[PDB]
């Protein structure tokens, strides 16, 4: 299937009591794998298959790198506040990563946000930064001036990030590449008088990616379907649902290459 690796950074200026100035967290798919923050000042694993397969050298080296990157975020955030003429507490975020698609193709992304809004989006195909406003444009020009760093970034998204992802994917295969099929049921109920509600409910499945829909007479898809979020159940699996309100209805579910139909 499609897997992904990504590293987030959150910087907060003038934080209240109890909020780190800086937090950085890594994920493989939906699973946290690493954590660092300005309070512990240490990078630690957040999955046991990460802890077991990476020697102390790794955590030691990246602890030093993250301290440096923490300092880098702090100063960048100061400059952005200056550009906007902002005071008080603001936030600064970035997301870097890559995906290895099921058909073997790849993607790579690198994005920044100021106060929770898109700010700069890197296009690794033209080696350029997309800016949302004039302040981002100011930063863009600075970053686009350094040709070699743009080349380094493209190489990191396309080659390094993908090789890290394959490495981590192997380490955690018993978790990441397993399949737990959905338990799926349909519930019927007359609600408001005259109104009958159909709910198609799935739970216990992994990976979280699941497709659910309602069909009428096997052909057309029903209009006005309500969708429920894919929610973590807390035991490593997920749950979700889809619902609608004198012909024949059926719920269709696809999960990890297996298709399921529940007729009413």
């Amino acid at each position, epitope marked *: 299937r499609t897997h992904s690796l990504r590293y987030f950074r959150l910087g907060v200026s003038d934080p209240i009591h109890g909020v780190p100035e800086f937090i950085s967290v890594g994920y493989v798919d939906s699973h946290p794998i690493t954590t660092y923050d300005s309070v512990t000042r240490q990078k630690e694993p957040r999955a046991p298959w990460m802890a077991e397969n990476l020697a102390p050298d790794h955590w030691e*080296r*990246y602890t030093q*790198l993250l*301290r440096g990157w923490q*300092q880098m975020f702090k100063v960048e955030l100061k400059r952005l506040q200056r550009h906007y003429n902002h005071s008080g507490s603001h936030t600064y975020q970035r997301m870097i990563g890559c995906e290895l698609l099921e058909d073997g193709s790849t993607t790579g992304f690198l994005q920044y946000a100021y106060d929770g809004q898109d700010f700069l989006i890197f296009n690794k195909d033209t080696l350029s930064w997309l800016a949302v406003d004039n302040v981002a444009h100011t930063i863009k020009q600075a970053w686009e001036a350094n040709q*070699h*760093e743009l*080349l380094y970034q*493209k*190489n990191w998204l396309e080659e390094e990030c993908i090789a890290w992802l394959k490495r981590f994917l192997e380490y955690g295969k018993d978790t990441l590449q397993r399949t737990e099929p959905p338990l799926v049921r349909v519930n019927r109920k007359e609600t408001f008088p005259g109104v009958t509600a159909l709910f198609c409910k799935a739970h216990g499945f992994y990976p979280p990616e699941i497709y659910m829909t309602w069909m009428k007479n096997g052909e057309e898809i029903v209009q006005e379907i309500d969708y429920g979020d894919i929610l973590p159940s807390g035991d490593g699996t997920y749950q979700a649902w889809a619902s609608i309100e004198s012909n024949l209805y059926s719920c269709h579910v696809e999960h990890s290459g297996v298709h399921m139909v529940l007729q009413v």
Partner: antibody
Amino acid sequence: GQNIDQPTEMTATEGAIVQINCTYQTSGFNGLFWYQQHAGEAPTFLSYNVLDGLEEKGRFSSFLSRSKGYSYLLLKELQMKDSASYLCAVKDSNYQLIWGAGTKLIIKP
Amino acid sequence: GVTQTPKFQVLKTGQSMTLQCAQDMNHNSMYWYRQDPGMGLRLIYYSASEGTTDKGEVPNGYNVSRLNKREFSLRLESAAPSQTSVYFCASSVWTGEGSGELFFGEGSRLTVLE
């Protein structure tokens, strides 16, 4: 990573061409640098390659092949003043610099 | 760019010694290297930014102080003959960026004698 190899010494003739090879076998790759170091002097940055291709900077060019894992530093129209050691170094996947033992270039007038 | 001292120093075995390095380029990262005939540069200690330092490849016999953003001093607590070498301080804008190059100091020639 683990190792970087470049020849110990090369000798060419003034006015001609010399190519200095650097191969690397590293745990990941975040770019290859060349440095120039005159005898008794500090090393100074010459070039950086991280994608495939050839980058020219005056009489010097530097090439990288990612798939064959090697670089060369190309010096055209050699001058006596080009006599120096040339240092190859790769950044590995953890951004640690791994250094070649350097190539001493000797120019024959 | 990078100023380091002293250019030359003779030490008796067991003596203390501090090498100073300063950079006014507002760089965040600094390094101490030794250079010995027949091998590549070897990292002794480094400082990725102000307020953190760590061992490099050959930290034994040495320690360092990242005094402030500008200054990274190298200390030989008890000089030994094998520490006879050429020492280079270097800095870079950051660490963890692929293309950032090093800027080297002029070197310190250290000779440790019994």
